[PDB]
Swiss-Prot record:
The chain holds residues 459 to 507 of 1273 of the full protein. The gene is S. It comes from Severe acute respiratory syndrome coronavirus 2 (2019-nCoV). Residues 1-49 are annotated as: Receptor-binding motif. Changing residue 20 to K: In strain: Delta/B.1.617.2, Omicron/BA.1, Omicron/BA.2, Omicron/BA.2.12.1, Omicron/BA.2.75, Omicron/BA.4, Omicron/BA.5, Omicron/BQ.1.1, Omicron/XBB.1.5, Omicron/EG.5.1. This is Spike protein S1. Changing residue 40 to R: In strain: Omicron/BA.1, Omicron/BA.2, Omicron/BA.2.12.1, Omicron/BA.2.75, Omicron/BA.4, Omicron/BA.5, Omicron/BQ.1.1, Omicron/XBB.1.5, Omicron/EG.5.1. Changing residue 38 to S: In strain: Omicron/BA.1.
């Protein structure tokens, strides 16, 4: 679900689509909550940190 204002929760539980549950693995339609995030010198002004 979406975060409440001024509310935050952090967990490593794998998000599982309702129609394609995994229940024990990062399978199809199952995504880890965290995704990489970085920057490079070649990035444009809108892409700079």
């Amino acid at each position: 679900s979406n975060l409440k204002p001024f509310e935050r929760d952090i967990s490593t539980e794998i998000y599982q689509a309702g129609s394609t549950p995994c229940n024990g693995v990062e399978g199809f339609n199952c995504y880890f909550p965290l995704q990489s995030y970085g920057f490079q010198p070649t990035n444009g002004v809108g892409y700079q940190p």
